[PDB]
Amino acid sequence: MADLIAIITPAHDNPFFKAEAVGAEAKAKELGYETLVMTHDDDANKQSEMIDTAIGRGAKAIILDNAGADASVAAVKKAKDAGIPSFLIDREINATGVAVAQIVSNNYQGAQLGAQEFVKLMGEKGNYVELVGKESDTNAGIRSQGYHDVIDDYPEMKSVAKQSANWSQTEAYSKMETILQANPDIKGVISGNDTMAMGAIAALQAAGRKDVIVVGFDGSNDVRDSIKSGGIKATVLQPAYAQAQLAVEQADAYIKNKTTPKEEKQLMDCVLINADNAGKLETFALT
Ligand SMILES: O[C@@H]1[C@H](O)[C@H](O)CO[C@H]1O
Ligand SMILES: [Ca+2]
Ligand SMILES: [Cl-]
């Protein structure tokens, strides 16, 4: 009897994606839907399998945080041709008019906020390293660009390594160990996301370099807690919970009478998190 909404994200070991799934699930059930929550583990084939499952089960809409900007177009198009609309969150696909919605953070704006804080904490000088996200995710390059466009105004600041750790805490730890051995004179690390920042601060701490300034991106409870404890200095909040709920609200409107948002692509504002507002943050929302 109940209509079904399928929710598909990357693995829940990154709290960002878990929070999206829980937010979407909550809104779906609040509006009378049953839910089917699946993970694709950043694997396009697994994402294909999961969308087939949504189709097979008769989902009325799919909420998707995708497995690659290019690779995901065909999957979303498969669902579409099966008569099932997709409402994308967090990550864009490199196509318009396929998804009904793409509701993402303003990544360039956000990244600039975090870089501005990084520069301030750095006193406009010194050697730093950058950890970059997954090449398949347009968010990785957009954030890097925003960071670069701030930091390139400060000639005394110098990047001594720029490496991908693929949005992975464990990869970030290992990369940081190697980077730190090559570059003992680093003053700071700026990271494209919070799981990489957690890996970095762990590696720094284990090397006895607690003085190094780390700035992340996402606003997770884990990084909040680090900020509160004097670890990481700042992050940038993406409204993950609200974004997932908005996607479901749009899906429900569409299911009900084919209301579509005026603009497919929608941006949500980011907010800088630091010691002054970390205590107002919980599960990707400020109060
Ligand atoms: O926006 C998300 C989050 O930053 C996550 O932590 C990594 O993937 C990005 O696309
Ligand atoms: Ca500039
Ligand atoms: Cl891709």
Curated annotation (Swiss-Prot):
It is found in: Periplasm. The keyword Transcription does not apply. SUPFAM superfamilies: Periplasmic binding protein-like I. Keywords: Periplasm, Plasmid, Signal, Sugar transport, Transport. InterPro entries: Peripla_BP_I (IPR028082), SBP_2_dom (IPR025997). One of its GO terms (molecular function) is carbohydrate binding. One of its GO terms (cellular component) is periplasmic space. D-apiofuranose binds at N14, D90, R91, D137, T138, N139, R143, N193, D218, Q238. Pfam families: Peripla_BP_4. Its main location: periplasm. Part of an ABC transporter complex involved in D-apiose import. Binds D-apiose, D-ribose and D-ribulose. Belongs to the bacterial solute-binding protein 2 family. This is D-apiose import binding protein. It comes from Rhizobium etli (strain ATCC 51251 / DSM 11541 / JCM 21823 / NBRC 15573 / CFN 42). The lineage of its organism: Bacteria, Pseudomonadati, Pseudomonadota, Alphaproteobacteria, Hyphomicrobiales.
